[PDB]
């Protein structure tokens with residue numbers, strides 16, 4: 057029932073993305089993809105477990121968000137028989153707080169790395185669909201969640217390149233609204249970076 061329902065959700069967002077992420081031509085939906093993911097990292101900081109969030113603009117016009125929180129739980133849900141991470145990355149829930157599955161749905165590719173309980177876990181998605189169940193790839197002393205997404209050029213036209221200043225404005229805004237949380241923005245394309253703390 058869950059697999060069928062998840063795919064209905066991804067299909068729903070694919071066909072009517074204006075209802076979930078916003079305008080797909082003018083760049084406002086493309087940048088909102090970043091802010092949805094960052095918002096999830098801010099929830100983990102507001103729970104008191106994350107101190108630093110790193111937002112990177114990569115050269116291939118993908119964006120990663122890294123937190124040093126406790127990592128998305130990896131335990132296979134007894135209920136629907138897949139990692140809790142995959143439930144969070146794929147299940148749907150106005151045009152704010154839309155859930156990370158929307159970003160996943162409208163991403164050509166999405167990379168999940170979780171560090172938790174001594175192990176690194178990795179998963180790949182294409183258009184919201186897991187390539188393989190979450191899997192252990194190594195060990196670590198660290199904790200946190202890293203999400204990197206390549207926006208679908210099926211979904212996004214005209215403004216397809218992330219603009220530093222637009223991410224910079226909102227991240228500085230988010231650090232003002234959530235005192236304590238530290239945010240790094242880094243552009244791999246030209247080396248630019250900022251640090252937002254209030």
Ligand SMILES: CNc1cc(F)cc2cc(C(=O)Nc3ccc(C(=O)O)cc3)c(=O)[nH]c12
Nearest residue numbers: 096097100121122123125127128156201203
């Ligand atoms: C870049 N970071 C990031 C991106 C994203 F798209 C989703 C998330 C989701 C969580 C979360 O559910 N954290 C969480 C939930 C439950 C527990 C627990 O029960 O121990 C811990 C952490 C997170 O901590 N970080 C995220």
